[PDB]
């Protein structure tokens, strides 16, 4: 059958000395559903950049990387983001999240770009949290959260999209093999869930967990061994996001707003009083 991905002879290259360097060279790759692929290789090999191809961060201007049989070259980058909501659910070592949001919101974000009722997807998110085994942590700031739990929030965050495709920066490298390989076992569960997942690492040891290591070097794999609705929802939800961003700096917000207030108050002041004496 036809693999959902077809990276054949795709390669990126980027300027240096006003000429593109061999960050990547022509590579043939195919991917099924349920794959749990390691990205073993030397650091800085552009396998990260290759992951950026997997993230569709930029067109390689070479080959035909046929996502679900559809080449990346044809689709809009915004359409690629639409694919991301349709599929991709990326996760990183550094578990990046707003300090602003509660973890439920941090999971809430990807579907905000989707058009959907908030309460429903909040319930879905709670299901994702119970899937994480997390519940009490729901209202906490990520700073209030332990890092492995934060990474769990990255997982549920991927899950709200359905997690059809999952890139994974150093899943276990930020912390202990306990919770790390534990989360890796959850990755095995998602593999059991049949969603495609692809970890990236230069480390063979964590790569042993993966069902399909693939090593790249010198730009090529040395081997492959196995709507206006969101605009108004944007108005109110980012109204709340605004309140939170102000919460980040209530004092700065104070000086700012005061700078506004004295201004306009003085406007109407002098206008009305001058108009009155004029009367």
């Amino acid at each position: 059958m036809t693999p959902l991905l077809e990276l054949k002879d795709i390669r990126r290259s980027y300027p240096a000395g006003d000429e593109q360097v061999e960050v990547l060279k022509g590579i043939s790759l195919d991917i099924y559903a349920g794959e749990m692929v390691a990205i073993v290789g030397a650091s800085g090999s552009g396998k990260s950049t290759l992951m950026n191809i997997l993230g569709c961060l930029d067109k390689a201007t070479s080959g035909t990387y046929r996502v679900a049989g559809q080449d990346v070259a044809t689709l809009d980058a915004d359409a690629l983001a639409q694919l991301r909501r349709e599929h991709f659910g990326f996760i990183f070592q550094r578990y990046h999240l707003l300090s602003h949001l509660t973890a439920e919101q941090n999971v809430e974000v990807p579907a905000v770009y989707a058009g959907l009722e908030r309460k429903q997807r909040l319930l879905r998110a709670q299901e994702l949290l119970q899937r994480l085994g997390l519940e009490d942590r729901t209202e906490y700031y990520p700073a209030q959260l332990s890092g492995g739990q934060q990474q769990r929030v990255s997982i549920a965050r991927a899950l709200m999209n359905g997690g059809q495709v999952i890139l994974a920066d150093e899943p276990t490298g930020a912390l202990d093999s306990h919770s790390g390989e534990e989360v890796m076992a959850i990755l095995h569960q998602l593999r059991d869930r049949g969603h495609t997942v692809i970890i990236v690492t230069h480390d063979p040891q964590v790569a042993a967990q993966a069902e399909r290591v693939i090593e790249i070097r010198d730009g090529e794999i040395v081997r492959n061994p196995p709507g206006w609705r969101q605009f108004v929802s944007g108005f109110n939800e980012a109204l709340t996001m605004a309140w939170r961003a102000l919460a980040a700096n209530k004092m700065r917000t104070l000086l700012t707003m005061l700078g506004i207030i004295i201004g306009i108050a003085s406007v109407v002041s002098i206008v009305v009083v001058g108009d009155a004496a004029k009367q």
Binding site: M251, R252, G259
Partner: protein, 112 residues
Amino acid sequence: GIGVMNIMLVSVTERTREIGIRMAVGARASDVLQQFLIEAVLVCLVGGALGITLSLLIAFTLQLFLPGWEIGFSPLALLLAFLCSTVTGILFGWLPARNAARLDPVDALARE
């Protein structure tokens, strides 16, 4: 000019670890208020210089329009404007850098 205080407050807030390394090299608590307020009033004075410069540009601009209307320099008002920029400068930069003086090196370093 008031929001400039907010700006400096932000800048110093960014300097938190820098504040800690500066206290780490044994800076007096006064010293941060010193350098910061000095920088602030500095901005006030250079902005006062470019400001009076532009004001003079407007002055000659009004020399260009002379329906009998006449230019007249008032240097005392100039120096009063300078000192005014100064006192607004200290007025804005005083408190936030005072709070900076309040700060412990410890929290300014160990914090992440």
